[PDB]
Ligand binder design. Structure first.
Ligand SMILES: C[C@H](c1ccccc1)[C@H](C[C@H](O)CN1CCN(Cc2ccc3c(c2)OCO3)C[C@H]1C(=O)NC(C)(C)C)C(=O)N[C@H]1c2ccccc2C[C@H]1O
Lengths: 99, 99
């Protein structure tokens, strides 16, 4: 579809069996999800945002459905105010910016 | 243009008569640039993102050229890790997300 930017570009995603709302963020290099108890092994990581760094948990090869489009990749889980779908996954669903 | 997301969506902007590089950020509500001098009065403001809040200077109705397209709106200046073009200006140049 085509998403305008008058408001935050929020979409429905499916991960670990749960449906959530996530922001399509072209400015984010990685995908960061709100704290959730995902199964599997993970490794610690520090990611930097506008006002500093936060500590997150990195999970690899996690299947995720974005607005009906299947994708699979790395997901970082930590104390984020909102779920963020970054470029690592946006490229997978063939998302582009146009003007 | 149509921009893919395999690489950071960076573009050249012209502001205050100077050239700079900036990130097209659909996850950013406002536009924030690195510390620099801008003509006109400014008001102190606080914006929050991942990592926390930072103090910035708000300049209103500032003309800015983004990749050849003209826009005139609010521009925040402060200790941001990188130059970001948010939705307030992206909407002015008719930017949309597509997939
Ligand atoms: C989700 C987040 C959000 C928080 C709270 C409410 C809504 C969205 C967005 C994110 C922003 O799109 C992308 N942002 C641009 C600057 N660079 C910087 C960067 C680059 C390189 C780095 C680094 C940090 O650290 C080490 O290397 C960080 C990047 C970011 O936060 N990335 C991760 C992977 C951690 C998610 C964000 O910060 N948004 C705010 C925002 C932004 C600008 C102006 C106004 C406002 C208000 C908000 O909308």
């Amino acid at each position: 579809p085509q998403i305008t930017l008058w408001k935050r570009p929020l979409v429905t995603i499916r991960i670990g069996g749960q449906l959530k709302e996530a922001l399509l963020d072209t400015g984010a290099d990685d995908t960061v999800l709100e704290e959730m108890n995902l199964p599997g092994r993970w490794k610690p990581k520090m990611i930097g945002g506008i006002g500093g760094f936060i500590k997150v948990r990195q999970y690899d090869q996690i299947p995720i459905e974005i607005c009906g489009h299947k994708a699979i990749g790395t997901v970082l889980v930590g104390p984020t105010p909102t779920n963020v779908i970054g470029r690592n996954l946006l490229t997978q669903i063939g998302c582009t910016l146009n003007f």
